[PDB]
């Protein structure tokens, strides 16, 4: 079951504060939510033949 | 196998045999007439006596007049030579172009398909009408009803679903006329000859026709609907095609079945109908199915008596449909044509996984703004518009731009008003209602959203008036 964990990084991760680059992080967590549970149902193994 | 007439009441001839009683729903041949008179056995009244229902007129019959037994039900000639020909209840050519020569014959009465011959697969049949594409999408292989009073548009709407679906169809087609007027059944012959669907000269015709109109005796209108239903089953089970089927009007299968039920000796049920109102309907409608051998795409026009939807004859048809298009009278007093009730029309495929999750949210989100205009009509009628809030002067002005943007000019209605019939695609209605729900057109008036096609004509009509 090849799967990685992470840290709790949701609070200030949208507060990256680029040169008015709010969309850089506001799109970044938006990719982060959908990719998490969807790749979890990929990571372990295929079913029986 | 012979017998004599004993009693005659209207269209219920009594007949006594001597040996060889015919089983129920045989055919009997009355000897000594100029035309063909076929009697179909209904009952068995005891001690060698049957009670029959006649297909043509019974005037001129005397008692003792002989009656001969066929041996079989009403059979009609079915096959690929039936296309381009008009028939009646017993299957004789009434186009005066000569006989119909097929290799096989099909009885009028057959059973229903089983449980394990059903097909569940659903799709979407895009038509080109905004009210039907958005709010209540039709399927490809399911029954459709068009409920309406008298003078609302149940057949101008059915002349569109031929003009949009029977042109781009690949398989065959079957039309049936049950109890509606005869000049309309003549303008379907002189509009399918001109437009290449009927070919008088060779075998390249697509549609079949079957006709019993509102001049017949009521033993014929009660059985003409089982005739076009049989020519549209050979093209399903034995040829394997994808057939259409247009029925107008299917109420007269039932209106003319409570005119011969009084004289068979039966106590009447509620408001005057026969005791068996909803078993003969569930035996005619249970054969109009998509199955594992073909697919019939029904479109039936249904009449509601005296503009009442709780009457027992319309309100038992509802369990046999998939889509539903309840039309209305008070809508059509405003001018919204097709006068479809957006709140009363359903489907079984309006679903976010089938119709697509973007479309499903413009669907449910435009009913929400339409209900909230209805729920304030008590206060607006008495008090006024001017005693409302500012948020609820913005579900009133936005839901009067949406009602007007459901009326579309039809192709068959160019000859009435002189306006070009418009067909919209599916993807240009979802895009065109999200720009009324989000609030981009809140400066354009409401006379610009009226009787236009795609949404760019609404800003163009608004460009004209200035």
């Amino acid at each position: 079951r090849k799967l990685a964990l992470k840290a709790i990084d949701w609070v200030a991760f949208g507060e990256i504060i680029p040169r008015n680059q709010k969309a850089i992080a506001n799109s970044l967590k938006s990719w982060n939510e959908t990719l998490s549970t969807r790749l979890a149902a990929l990571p372990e193994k295929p079913p029986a033949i | 196998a012979t017998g004599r007439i004993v009693a005659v009441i209207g269209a219920v001839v009594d007949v006594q045999f001597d040996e060889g009683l015919p089983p129920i729903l045989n055919a009997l041949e009355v000897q000594g007439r100029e035309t063909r008179l076929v009697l179909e056995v209904a009952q068995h009244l005891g001690e060698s006596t049957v009670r029959t229902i006649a297909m043509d007129g019974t005037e001129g019959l005397v008692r003792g007049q002989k009656v001969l037994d066929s041996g079989a039900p009403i059979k009609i000639p079915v096959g690929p030579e039936t296309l381009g020909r008009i028939m009646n209840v017993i299957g004789e050519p009434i186009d005066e172009r000569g006989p119909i020569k097929t290799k096989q014959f099909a009885a009028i009465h057959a059973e229903a398909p089983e449980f394990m011959e059903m097909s569940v697969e659903q799709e979407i049949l895009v038509t080109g009408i905004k009210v039907v594409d958005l709010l209540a999408p039709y399927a490809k292989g399911g029954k459709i009803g068009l409920f309406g009073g008298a003078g609302v548009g149940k057949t101008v709407l059915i002349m569109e679903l031929i003009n949009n679906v029977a042109k781009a169809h690949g398989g065959y087609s079957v039309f049936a006329g049950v109890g509606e007027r005869t000049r309309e059944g003549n303008d379907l012959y002189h509009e399918m000859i001109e437009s290449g669907v009927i070919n008088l000269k060779d075998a390249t015709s697509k549609v079949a026709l079957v006709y019993g109109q509102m001049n017949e005796p009521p033993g014929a209108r009660a059985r003409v609907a089982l005739t076009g239903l049989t020519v549209a089953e050979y093209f399903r089970d034995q040829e394997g095609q994808d057939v259409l089927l247009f029925i107008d009007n299917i109420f007269r299968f039932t209106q003319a079945g409570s005119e011969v039920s009084a004289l068979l000796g039966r106590i009447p049920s509620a408001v005057g109908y026969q005791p068996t109102l909803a078993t003969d309907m569930g035996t005619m409608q249970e054969r109009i199915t998509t199955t594992k051998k073909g697919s019939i795409t029904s479109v039936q026009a249904i009449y509601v008596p005296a503009d009442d939807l709780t009457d027992p004859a319309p309100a038992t048809t509802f369990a046999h449909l998939d889509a539903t298009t309840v039309l209305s009278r008070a809508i059509a007093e405003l001018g919204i044509y097709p006068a479809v009730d957006p709140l009363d029309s359903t489907s079984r495929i309006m679903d976010p996984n089938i119709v697509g999750s973007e479309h499903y949210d413009v669907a449910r989100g435009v009913q929400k703004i339409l209900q909230d205009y209805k729920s304030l009509q008590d206060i607006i009628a008495i008090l006024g518009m001017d005693e409302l809030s500012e948020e609820d002067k913005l579900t009133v002005s936005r839901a009067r731009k949406i009602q007007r943007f459901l009326s579309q000019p039809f192709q068959v209605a160019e000859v009435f008003t002189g306006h070009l019939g418009k067909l919209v695609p599916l993807k240009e209605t979802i895009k065109g209602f999200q720009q009324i729900l989000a609030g981009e057109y809140d400066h354009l008036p409401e006379q610009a959203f009226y009787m236009v096609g795609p949404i760019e004509e609404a800003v163009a009509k608004a460009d004209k008036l200035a």
């Binding site: 990256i16 680029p18 040169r19 680059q21 850089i24 | 697969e121 394997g240 594992k292 051998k293």
Partner: protein, 70 residues
């Protein structure tokens, strides 16, 4: 009716003498078993006998983020 019990077994054994499928098919069983064999493939799909899955997938390209900082 054991005299009928023997008479439906003995004309079942005659059916067990078969050469090519149907005995009295003619144009009937040949057309129907070919009409039905299409319908189990028509709305189902075009599939051969033993061909394996042949495709290729491309993943999302990992772009970078430019950031002058401090």
């Amino acid at each position: 009716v054991q005299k009928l019990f023997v008479d439906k077994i003995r004309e079942y054994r005659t059916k067990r003498q078969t050469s090519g499928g149907p005995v009295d098919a003619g144009p009937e069983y040949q057309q129907d078993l070919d009409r039905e064999l299409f319908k189990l493939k028509q709305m189902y799909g075009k599939a051969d006998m033993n061909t394996f899955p042949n495709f290729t997938f491309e993943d999302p390209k990992f772009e970078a983020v430019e950031k002058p900082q401090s």
